[PDB]
Design a protein around this ligand. Structure first.
Ligand SMILES: *[C@@H]1O[C@H](CO)[C@@H](O[C@@H]2O[C@H](CO)[C@@H](O[C@@H]3O[C@H](CO[C@H]4O[C@H](CO)[C@@H](O)[C@H](O)[C@@H]4O)[C@@H](O)[C@H](O[C@H]4O[C@H](CO)[C@@H](O)[C@H](O)[C@@H]4O)[C@@H]3O)[C@H](O)[C@H]2NC(C)=O)[C@H](O)[C@H]1NC(C)=O
Ligand SMILES: *[C@@H]1O[C@H](CO)[C@@H](O[C@@H]2O[C@H](CO)[C@@H](O)[C@H](O)[C@H]2NC(C)=O)[C@H](O)[C@H]1NC(C)=O
Ligand SMILES: *[C@@H]1O[C@H](CO)[C@@H](O)[C@H](O)[C@H]1NC(C)=O
Lengths: 208, 51
């Protein structure tokens, strides 16, 4: 589940089943690729290091749900949010509340950095070929990559990771292509064509 | 006080068909085994506006 908020506005996030008794709900902000950081306990009591921006619902209300109020949303707050529910009426939950991804909107645009790498020489004597296109710092992660044999598309061997955000608006995607030793020398020059959001950028390489 | 007591209940509603068998469970909670559960939640068959 995803929440998209304009910059500088206030976000809200919904966690868990409806309340049954007076509760004590914990709020966690897990950033992509990192560990969960404790944000709020006692339903509104935030520890050291957390600004008074983040809020919640006091666990004194029955029938309503657990709400997280992010005031003045900033870019860093892009993360997954979990919550641990302690209802006086329901047994101790060991399955954390299901996630809710915050998405600040209009970062707005990042042009990818495509870094094409030929196979390494030690790999060449080892009888294996591999092409390493490396796409960094792009937004958003909607990149689709094709490969060209001097003028012609390549069908098989194509390997490509997923656009992966990393503690920053920047994304990341690799692109490997397994090739036979005889064909890196046979063809003229190989092409990595990375397509992002509507802009295609292509990097080629030629053998020595 | 007794006379007034019965006189106040003479025109009110009699529960003579409320002796139907009941099917009960303990109440909705994280039971603390010590407390037996002071209330019970029960389904039963009741007659409607039609016999
Ligand atoms: C004492 O015991 C009685 C049993 O007779 C309890 O009464 C039942 O209470 C439960 C709640 O615990 C009721 O279950 C709920 O029913 C709601 C109504 O369902 C209608 O709508 C759905 C579609 O929306 C239809 O499928 C259905 O046929 C009905 O037409 C549902 O909306 C509820 O769903 C919610 O809870 C589930 C729990 O898993 C969630 O997954 C859902 O997403 C949703 O949030 C729920 O199913 C039941 O209907 C009651 N029955 C009667 C006869 O009253 C008392 O609650 C209980 N009281 C105490 C104090 O113990
Ligand atoms: C209340 O009435 C229900 C029907 O509304 C009855 O359910 C019957 O239960 C018996 C088992 O005791 C089954 O053999 C029958 O098939 C059920 N349906 C009938 C008889 O139509 C039941 O008698 C009552 N249940 C209670 C009091 O919990
Ligand atoms: C209800 O409470 C009694 C109290 O003695 C307990 O023994 C029993 O297990 C309970 N039944 C339930 C929770 O279904």
């Amino acid at each position: 589940t995803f929440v998209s908020v304009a910059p500088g506005q206030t976000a809200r996030i919904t966690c868990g089943e409806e309340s049954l008794g007076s509760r004590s709900v914990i709020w966690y902000q897990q950033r992509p690729g990192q560990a969960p950081s404790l944000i709020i306990y006692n339903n509104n009591d935030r520890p050291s290091g957390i600004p008074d921006r983040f809020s919640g619902s006091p666990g004194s209300t029955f029938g309503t749900t657990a709400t997280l109020t992010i005031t003045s949303v900033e870019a860093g707050d892009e993360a997954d949010y979990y919550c641990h529910i302690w209802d006086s009426r329901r047994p101790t939950n060991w399955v954390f509340g299901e996630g809710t991804t915050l998405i600040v909107l209009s970062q707005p645009k990042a042009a990818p950095s495509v870094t094409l790498f030929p196979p390494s020489s030690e790999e060449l004597q080892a009888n294996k070929a591999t092409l390493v296109c490396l796409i960094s710092d792009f937004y958003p992660g909607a990149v689709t990559v094709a490969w060209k044999a001097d003028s012609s598309p390549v069908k098989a061997g194509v390997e490509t990771t997923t656009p992966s955000k990393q503690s920053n608006n920047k994304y990341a995607a690799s692109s490997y292509l397994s090739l036979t030793p005889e064909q890196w020398k046979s063809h003229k020059s190989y092409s990595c064509q990375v397509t992002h959001e509507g802009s295609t950028v292509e990097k080629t390489v030629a053998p020595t | 006080i007794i006379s007034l007591w019965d006189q106040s209940l003479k025109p009110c509603v009699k529960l003579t068909p409320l002796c139907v068998t009941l099917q009960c469970t303990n109440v909705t909670n994280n039971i603390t085994d010590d407390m037996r559960g002071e209330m019970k939640n029960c389904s039963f068959n009741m007659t409607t506006e039609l016999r």
